[PDB]
Design a protein around this ligand. Sequence first.
Ligand SMILES: Nc1ncnc2c1ncn2[C@@H]1O[C@H](COP(=O)(O)OP(=O)(O)OP(=O)(O)O)[C@@H](O)[C@H]1O
Ligand SMILES: [Zn+2]
Ligand SMILES: [Zn+2]
Ligand SMILES: [Zn+2]
Lengths: 53, 53, 127, 112, 65, 178, 43, 45, 134, 112, 49
Amino acid sequence: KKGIAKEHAKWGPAAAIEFEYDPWNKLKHTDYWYEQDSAKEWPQSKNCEYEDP
Amino acid sequence: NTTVLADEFIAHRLGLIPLQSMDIEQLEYSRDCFCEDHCDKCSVVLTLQAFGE
Amino acid sequence: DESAPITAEDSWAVISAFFREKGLVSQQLDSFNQFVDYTLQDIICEDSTLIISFGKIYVTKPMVNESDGVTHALYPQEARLRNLTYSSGLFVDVKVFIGRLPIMLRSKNCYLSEATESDLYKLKECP
Amino acid sequence: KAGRLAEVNLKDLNNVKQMVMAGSKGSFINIAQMSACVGQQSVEGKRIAFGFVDRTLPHFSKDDYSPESKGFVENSYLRGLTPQEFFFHAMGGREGLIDTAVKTAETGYIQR
Amino acid sequence: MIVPVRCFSCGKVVGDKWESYLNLLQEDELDEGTALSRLGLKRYCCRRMILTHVDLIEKFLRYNP
Amino acid sequence: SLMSCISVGTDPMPIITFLSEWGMEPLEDYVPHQSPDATRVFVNGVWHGVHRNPARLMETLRTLRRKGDINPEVSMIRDIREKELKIFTDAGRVYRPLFIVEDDESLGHKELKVRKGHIAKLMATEYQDEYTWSSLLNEGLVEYIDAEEEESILIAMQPEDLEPDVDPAKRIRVSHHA
Amino acid sequence: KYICAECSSKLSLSRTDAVRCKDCGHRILLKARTKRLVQFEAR
Amino acid sequence: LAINAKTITSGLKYALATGNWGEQKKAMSSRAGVSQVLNRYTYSS
Amino acid sequence: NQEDSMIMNQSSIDRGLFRSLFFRSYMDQEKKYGMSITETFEKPQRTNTLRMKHGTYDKLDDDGLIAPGVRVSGEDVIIGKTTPISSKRDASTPLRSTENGIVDQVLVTTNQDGLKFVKVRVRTTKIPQIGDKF
Amino acid sequence: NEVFSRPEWMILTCLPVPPPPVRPSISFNESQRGEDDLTFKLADILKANISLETLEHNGAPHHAIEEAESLLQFHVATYMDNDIAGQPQALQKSGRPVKSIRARLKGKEGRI
Amino acid sequence: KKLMAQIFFGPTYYQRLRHMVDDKIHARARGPMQVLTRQPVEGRSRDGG
RNA sequence: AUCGAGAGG
DNA sequence: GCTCCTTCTCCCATCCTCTCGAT
DNA sequence: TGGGAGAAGGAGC
Ligand SMILES: Nc1ncnc2c1ncn2[C@@H]1O[C@H](COP(=O)(O)OP(=O)(O)OP(=O)(O)O)[C@@H](O)[C@H]1O
Ligand SMILES: [Zn+2]
Ligand SMILES: [Zn+2]
Ligand SMILES: [Zn+2]
């Protein structure tokens, strides 16, 4: 029968929807957790290749 | 069901099988269909017959 | 390559050998096996003369005395399903039947001790 | 003092420090035991006694009164406890379960 | 018990990647990581679904009934 | 525990007939004089007699037990500060197996009797589906020690411990190296 | 409508027929399965 | 004949099925905690 | 998730996370109560029996048992038997009040005394729910 | 007290027997019924009293009348207190001690 | 929106225990009572208080 | 019913 | 007549809840 | 059964 994923997860056709924005922390929406250095301990995301540092 | 699996176990596994739904917009919801538990314009009937020969 | 000292990794081979020989419930199977083989006869022989004198004792394989029926072999699954008691008769060569001793599973008197994995699956017993 | 030296040199964005600062959960002793050292293990108000003859465990020589020999856990939970320290910690922490199931009846009678 | 259909964490189908996983492990002699990556299981939520699974069904299939 | 067993019971008489042949003095012909440096030989809690030079007796008993002549579940305890030799043979004693360290004067420091060749034999036997746990026991490589006998031995936690730049994150091991 | 553990005689076993099997002398029986169609919600 | 087997059987079948390690007429000996129903909730249990 | 509680993903639960099967086995025998007396495993009647359980007897078969594959819920009667007097009394065994399921297997066996007895296994699924302990 | 409590009333001559509600016949399962402990104890009291009456009617050797009186005293004492120190407890057919009124009124599971 | 605090995230082995609310919930509305003391009977299975 | 076991906060 | 005086008899020992046995 | 009372019975001045 026809249905949506709200009623049961068996009706959901989206396995995983990766969602990201601002690969660099320009907007300061996240305060990075660090021990000694904050830029060398957090891996650089791939989408950082599409924005100016 | 002579199998070593429970009926509801197999039913749950069947419910999770992805089925083609490209033309889902043409079918009607069960709640909105002037029909019964099964029909042709609000549901699709499948049959599984297996034997361990 | 024959007398080199052991590293901290190689002791797991020793532990594997220990658990392959002893097992996990040997501390109950070896105690019960002593009781049937040796302790039972010692209890039977000690001060057993009514001066009549009891002698050798024989422990059969587990069996069920069916009502108005021939005594047949009893397997643990049958005992579990039919609410029976897994026990074997003791015959004292005074050979008089004196009672039934319950039998520990996978002991020397249990069928499962002489059953392979295929036999255990056939007997509906988990290996 | 080791725990205080550890807590002082913990940054403000440390999550366990923020919980201690707020007082929601955790305390100084938790910081000391998880980061610096578990400390001394005591049972019945006294340190670990000699269950064997002149020693606490068969892995120590007799007439040994060093702190490590009688239940001082120099390690933290992050670093991990050695088998002797693990057993000493188990001995110390069992007392925390006995007084929960045994000595609770001695204070309920008081209240009754 | 048999094969974890779909994926609790996301919902990707992993019920059709068990026989292929076993063939990669045995016939192709690859290790678990390379076989898992060659099956298209990138996310570690899907990766644990096939990596950590006990196929007890075979044992249940060894009894007469 | 995983590697703890309970003794099943053994006849003490074969041990006793050893002691009378190893030089023990029967308690009948024992005078508590002319022999102050003498050990009280007990068996199963019964003071069977008194024996002089207990070191040789203990050495012989340990040699017999690490060969199979004495049941490996028989615990033999010597306590010098009371000069008492206690052999136990009854059932109900909880023991655990552990390795045996010998002097090994050839290779300097003391080293375990069991070596990598025995491990290779065990692994080959496991993968041959001959050399089992009993083979280790019968060769003196592994010994059963109960709680009472633990009061007369010194045990090393790891083989590396007995062996006579540094990771800061590794746990602190004292390694007093007795 | 009764199936023994060993072999599957599928006997009738009315009041008079009692509890037993033909082929094998085994003393446990399973009373087959209901004819009524079951219905499970696949969720 | 002339031997009452039940005395053994019903003996060994009572304590072993109750835990009262003794005859049914005795309550002094270690009782009710010798034989316990095997816990099969999990293999580790 | 405060105070040692958890938030579980409903979508993951829908896909089979921590689901389980629960089997319960009820047992019932018939015993003599005398020298030449015997109880009977049969479908209880509505007028002969002296007692009732207010449960639904519409699911029992002729022999007083329910064949596997029947959804039994609440106060339903699963092993129905009637005992005589020394007309007929009622000794049927119903389900647990708060338990429901589907009949899995029905074992009909003879006791060591030659008396017919029956075990019935009921199977249920326990989906994780708010308040379950992990 | 002259009206409510005299010493002569501490020696029992006429004993009140309670109604069935005090000692109901508990009926567990279906056919596994049985009278209460107090009913059995009162039946024993009646048996002892009838034994004394018969012996007195027979003028039995005083050495047997004394034994019968001791039996009556023991049974009527255990009826109200089965926890008497230094004496054997009266037992049921099953071999368990009877539950006297004193045991019913005493303890965390008592009436009060 | 992003969260200012990064969340510790990873696989962990969890076990389901025998204790479930559907087997613990109870409520009594003047059900069965005892015959001796005429008080509410004891037990969830007996519809007790 | 009684007895006993195991188990949770 | 205290002086005790040692020696005895004595009643206690958290709360609530769940399930499964055997008679 | 693990300490406590309180009570009791006994010796000694
Ligand atoms: N023997 C007891 N007597 C009285 N109350 C008890 C007893 N045992 C447990 N409790 C109750 O249960 C609670 C104990 O909670 P629990 O056992 O979950 O440990 P906790 O203190 O909550 O810490 P955690 O949950 O980390 O173990 C107490 O608050 C207490 O009210
Ligand atoms: Zn329709
Ligand atoms: Zn996934
Ligand atoms: Zn058959």
